[model samples]
Target: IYPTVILCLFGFFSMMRPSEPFLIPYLSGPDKNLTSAEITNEIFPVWTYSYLVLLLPVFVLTDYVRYKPVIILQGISFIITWLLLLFGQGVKTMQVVEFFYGMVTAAEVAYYAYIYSVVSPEHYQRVSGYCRSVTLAAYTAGSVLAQLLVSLANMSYFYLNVISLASVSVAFLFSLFLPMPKKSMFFHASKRLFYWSLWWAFATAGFNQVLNYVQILWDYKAPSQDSSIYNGAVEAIATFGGAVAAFAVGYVKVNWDLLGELALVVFSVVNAGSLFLMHYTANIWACYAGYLIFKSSYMLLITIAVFQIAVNLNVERYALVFGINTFIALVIQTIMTVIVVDQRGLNLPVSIQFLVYGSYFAVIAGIFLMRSMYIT
Candidate 1:
């Protein structure tokens, strides 16, 4: 009961970014007085890419110092992030604040990792679902509230940031009481080098997560008069759809060891096709549909991948490998950011970028399909 309450509190505050639906517009909007190129090409890429730079070190730190400290740091980072979002000015300030935002992202590893350390394995499934679902619910609630405030209640972005700040402040207070892990693989080091397939599963899931996040930026570009409401609707629908898919997974069964590879192929194909549709179409409704499908695919695949990867490994090694794969995914995302988004390279337009993203997934699908068919 105590662990569940702590986990729910952590997830609730962590996800209460009320300004998310309006973030891009708020920064690129007239109130901020920032150029689109500055916001998108410079600031946004920095925010995304910094995760690669910070995540690995922070992950290792999480193990060395244990999970509670990092979790607290995550909450502190969120407070700082929102404060900056509310009060900070200029491109340089925004860039620096985004570095803190990356710290917040890196620190998230502690939240889930902390859960396993505190609770018995028997409670893992229920608690994991509780935590994950609470965060999703928080995101849904935040988006809906933001939409209503903007479209209906007429609240400003500044106020939304303030609301987020208050939420994280309370979360940080609760984080101080979270039970700490007694030991970690980093400090103990008895286990290393688990199965290759587990590594691939975790790494692939992480890579897909990066793509999923980038799609939010894509959705932000969809033509609409009230992008806040539109984005909020997409997020709300996708959350509900993903929730349904997750619930439905309980009623179905498969030989994960055999069919997991095939699942990967199907997941990649559907997601790639969704991105392609999003890229080729101009209609807002088409964009909404693609975003919904894309998010649903992510929810479905990640749930299955979590169960499949956990099948072979012990609890400790499972946690270690999870962190490692997350680092690898951030590395891949950084490379993509450099090529597709950073000012240093192609600096491709958003439309063309989606094409590249779709093609990347298509290639992944092809590789995995071949592996499933011919290899082991």
Candidate 2:
């Protein structure tokens, strides 16, 4: 019970970052005073590419070391991220920030992966809820609070970083208090089960792409104008709807096994429409509306994918499957980042970048649709 409670605290505090949504505004504002081009081409590229690079080492390596040390690294890395964000200057320094940022995201597999081995299956459901529920609520409340702090209270972006620092600092301390877990195998939305039907990889990769640049898109549609932007509520409401979906999917009577790919094709088009709306439309309100639509759809589908994959497998194979699948997704993400995102490549406008993402998602739906018919 204590371990579960401790883990929940770790999860909750780690996510209580109020500044997350305003990253673009903060970076481009006087705080860092980066050009939009530098933010896109120079500072941001490293985070996308670095996360790809760093994600590989931790997959099997995490299993090798067991979960606690890697979990500990997750706590440590976020403080490094915010510390750099707060004090670090110049594009190079921010790139280092982004690099540690990747390490923080890359280390995420450790904490979720920790629970399966640490306790028995009988208690798995309880332990899972204990941690994930607060974690979800924390992000929702966290972003909402940040939004209020910036908009209603007229807070500066720098102080937001201070709050973020405090939050992760608290999480970092709790990470140290965590009990070591046994080294063994079990399952959660661990990504490697493609042969059990492979859409999770494609959808997840694309989903990750949207998240990586979501705030940047928000900024493009509505420029921040040097330290007066609040992105908290959009994220807050978006996630609240997402968490609301978890329970709806929780009781789903329809088995995902037979119609899952077909299900993917439908939402695949649906989510593409959501992006198309946000991409072509200039109105921030409409963009947020589309974002709400987009967030809810993916939230449910990804949960569905997890229910399908995480069961029926042990930890090592679970390790390999997730490792390879995400690695594949990483390279795909990197390839898109290079040709489309990097200035040496297309270096398209931020809004136009979403056009490519929209097309990419539609094509995935088409590909899966064909596969569904072939197998049908």
Candidate 3:
């Protein structure tokens, strides 16, 4: 119960980073005084690409130091991140801030992993679902709070970051009280599973990361006149939609033995269609619908994939394998970012980038369907 309270506090404060929706605008708007290139081609890609470079080592360190220390650092990193955003100026400073943002990303490995170390396996499902639901709810609440402050209260972005600082500071305080784990594991695995389904873990996690990262860029380049309202609505709706899908997963029945492959193919097709709609249409309503479909499908698909991976592996290996799988997803995301959005690479415009992502989903659909029909 104490651990549950601590974990919930962690979730609540960790997500109170209010600058998420307004980040692009803050960097590029007249207020921040940063150049377009500085915001997009430079700082953003640095933030994106740095995660893969740092994630594996960070995961190992998180395990080595045990969860409490890294979780503390996670909170501290957010504090620094928001502070930098609020008070720091110049492109170089922003770049440094993004580097710390990557640290925040790397530190997130501790949040969920900490739970497994503390809770009994019997309580795993309930506590796991609770932690996740709390995190998601906090994110939605934070976004809505930020939007309300901006749209209704006329709060400045800088002030929003200041508010974020307050929440993160409280999170840091909570982390100090979090009990250390009884046991921890880094890269060293105590036991091994005979048949770990690597392909399912990697493929599903990789594509989901790609979709999640690109959607941020999509919002950055969106053509809406009132981007705050648009972003707020999309994020709130997506979060709620994901919650609905997650709730529905308990009741939905499907025979994975017979239709697992087919289910993947169908989700891929639906996601592809949603992406296409977003890519071609600038209409706000159409874009919102597209985002809803894509986000909800992703929520459902990833939930199924997680259950599949869990059933396939031993309980002891869950953390290690899932950590490695997360690293793999980050690797895939970094490569995609380098080729499509990095300054040294093609640096495709946002619309074309959407098309590229859409094409990836299309190819995923084709490949999985072909595998079902031929290979499997």
Candidate 4:
């Protein structure tokens, strides 16, 4: 109970990051004094490599040393991310910021892994619900707060960074208070994980690829200095709508079993259409709408997939199953970053990137639709 409370708070503060919604705007707004071409292009891709390089090490190391150390390290890594965002200047320094952020992203697994270790199997579902719910709510809460402050109270992006720093500092502080567990868990070979893992990893990989770049598109449509922004409110709605989409699934009337394959076909196309909308829109508001639909569909589908996976999985195996799936998901995503983005000759502009992203999902939808055909 105590661990759940503390971990919920840790997740709350960690996810209560206000500045995330405005990153693209801040980067180009003369506060950091960097061009989007170099900043968005060359520098941020460091996180893919950062996450790629450290993920396996952290994944295995958590069990060897136990979860708290990795949890604590995650807290520290988070502080470094915003700390560098505030203080670290120049192109190379910001690259280091992305490096630490890669640590923050990769080490995020520690939070979930810790929960599985500390709690019993019986309460796992409720406990998981509590911890998971807080992150989404806090993100929306923080976004709402930032919107009010930025839109009404007129704070600079500077204050938002400080606010983010303060929140993560609190998360780090309480992360120290988490109880050390005597035990940790590892992966086991399981045959049943195949199809769900396939959909999970593939969908997650593509979702992330789109999610990473969507914001920069908004800024392209409407620059910060030219327009008074509701980026925070946009994020709030986006997060909120996705939650509604998730919660609606709890008791909804759908035969996800027989219908699940077909569901993916439709929803994956929904994801594709959303991205296509994003790529085509000249209006920032339309672009924002596209992101809302994109996130909500991903949110809805991923929730169902989690339940689908969780029902059959043994408790101890939860951590590693997710770990490896995420590992594979990121591997696929890193290749995406390389070929679609980082490749000098092949990489397209952001609009074109969304075109590729939209097409990517359509192809997934097509493949699975045909896979379903072969089943009959």
Candidate 5:
């Protein structure tokens, strides 16, 4: 048991070490010549739309056929992606790399579903928190470390890709030890996962991302004196702060008998309130603080939801459940993309974007709070 946790943490951190720290920076920096707008317009659509073809089949297999193979397949997909991105010659090659990497990421979505089976029920909250913390800790450390590498000595994107590829290799080793769940039960119970609560999860994810865009949008609106890197720095600090909160939440769950819904409600309320404060003021520091409070709450809610649902839902079919979620989130994201297109399709004002996203959470929190009361 201890070995599994240790190994899982190691694999998770190593993978995240590249993604969290270097992903956005790599796209934004080495690719610095490319505007965020250009990247958004060109790269994202290709990746998001093309991956659905591969993702659909993987989802079906996880539900109706095998579970263990999904993990193995994900590892192979990631390895190919990193290799392509590292060695590929030109922009076309880079785009192809991004396309396959997108599929690999989307395919890896099936993992948390697989995780519910290997660990004990009593350990769900602890395990979930540990997982989130490790991922964030890896990312935070990676980002800070990457920044230093850039400042002190030049590091190539190739180095990070190599590191990520190595970690995926290690993760597959752990997946090999996870027992395959009974396929019959998962295949049978899979349809119910399309329920309202699940759809709401996806909707919530989209709404959250929109709010995140608002932060960047605000950074754009700020005078040139303050660069977007300042915004990233603030977020990195806030991310570590959230990591500490996640670790503490894991501790509380281990020691106290706390209802998942109660935690969700508190986090939602504080998050919404913080956003409202940010909407009214442009004071960057205050807004950064607001983001910390709001983002911390948001992360906690996600942790609770993922843990709660994974425990209650059938383990073998968990991939399908998240696949349903992934589809919904993509659809919602498409709508947001269209909405963000301003006059000539310019992004909406940051304040307006916050209002739009905040409303979604405000409604979700109200409904969930009521549902929690009735259930408890």
Candidate 6:
């Protein structure tokens, strides 16, 4: 369990290093010579959306490809993705490079699956919880580091890519040493888990889209003299809050019982309703408050769900469940992106529209999850 967690921690650190936040700003920089529309429409889409293609192969790679080989391949893929982005000349270069990056990053599904193999059945939930905690904590740290690099060192596309490559290089070194589990293969995630996970996927996608797009909302609400400074600060605080929430979630089991453990669901509902109120507030504090409540709650839900499923399912099948979850989320995010960031221009009302959709999704998912009480 320790080895698997350490190995995955390394991978997760690199994976979270320069994701949605850094990707757009780096690509659309004045020096980079890419336009806003190109970054949003072409590069962003290819990087996250194209990952859908990698879904099926996750299972095949683990079962047949061997863990060591696949992990090393993942490292190489990261290096290649960064190299392409580092020297990218224009739109096409960024598109092809990020597409490859998305495919490689999908290897986390395999990594998670393998982690399950190294643990006993009774310990899987706790191990999975630890994994999620480490993942979120690492991501929080990575975001802060990325912000510092961009701010203090004036880290441009070239150096940012270097840091990303270096991060994954470390991952490759650690992965080379990961111990293979005794049992090689087994069925994971029953068909029920697959279908149920899809619903959670939708909730996950909606929450992610809203969170990513919250920057636009902040910019509109705050309009500080130093917009860059405000953004950096907000990102730092948000990451810290999320990491704290994730760590707290690691301490508790995902008690699916309806009566006693409704805090998270209630909080999600209130958090969504708070967004409606904040939609009218002119104060930046109100906007930030809304963001904190909404994001913290979402993080809790995801961590709990990750722990719950990891314990309940089999090792070999964790990849299938995660891959399917990722696929479903990506599909919704794809459509939402074209609609929110593409066809309809980003504005206050559009942000509220995202809020409504996201809140509704959480409500529906919470209701469906309540069924567990009856079944068990």
Q: Return the top candidate by TM-score.
A: 4
Tens digit per residue, CA lDDT, model 4, 259-370: 6776767788889999999888888888888888989998888888887898777767776688889889989998888888873646566867888898889988888878
> How many backbone overlaps does candidate 3 show?
0
Per-residue lDDT of 1-376 in model 5, one digit per residue for the tens? 5544753654464455454334434555553344456545455445655565566676666656565667667767677776765565455665687678666766555554455555674464456556655666666765566555544555565575576677666766665566676523355454323444463465466444654354444444453222523443555677787776655665564522255456557777787777776776767667777877887776676655555567667644454566677676766665665566332355555556666666766776787677768757
In model 4, the worst 10-residue window by lDDT is 183-192
Candidate 3 per-residue C-alpha lDDT over 1-376 given as tens digits, one digit per residue, 9 for 90 to 100: 8988998987888886677766766666667766554456677777756676777777888777788888888888888888888889888888888889888878777777788777786566678888888888888888888777887887777787788888888888888888888777544641112222444444554454444444455554563225544566467778789888877775587676565666666876888888888788866578778888988887777777676767766666676777777776667767777787677899776656678888877876776667557634
Candidate 5: TM-score?
Answer: 0.67
TM-score of each predicted structure versus truth? 0.88, 0.92, 0.90, 0.95, 0.67, 0.75
Lowest summed lDDT over 10 consecutive residues: which window, candidate 2?
Answer: 186-195
In candidate 4 the C-alpha lDDT for residue 243 amounts to 89
Following a full C-alpha superposition, what root-mean-square deviation does model 3 have from the true structure? 3.2
Q: Give the C-alpha miss distance for residue 20 in model 4, angstroms.
A: 0.9
Screening candidate 6 with a backbone cut-off below 3 angstroms (N, C-alpha, C), the clashing residue pairs are: 188-317
Q: List the residue pairs that clash in candidate 4.
A: none
Per-residue lDDT tens digits of candidate 2, residues 1-376?
7777788888899988987888888898877788787788877878878998889787667767778899889888998889989998998898899999898989877787788766775566667766777888999989998998888888888998899999999998988868887645632323335544357777777888888787888888778884345479989999898888776787768877766776766777889999999898968888888888898888788778777776767544554667777888788888888898898888876768889999998998888777668757
RMSD of each: 3.4, 3.1, 3.2, 1.9, 5.8, 5.0
Candidate 5: list runs displaced more than 4 Å.
1-10, 22-25, 30-32, 45-56, 63-65, 83-95, 115-133, 151-203, 211-236, 247-266, 273-287, 304-326, 341-355, 359-376
In model 3, how large is the Cα lDDT of residue 105?
Answer: 79
Best candidate according to lDDT: 4
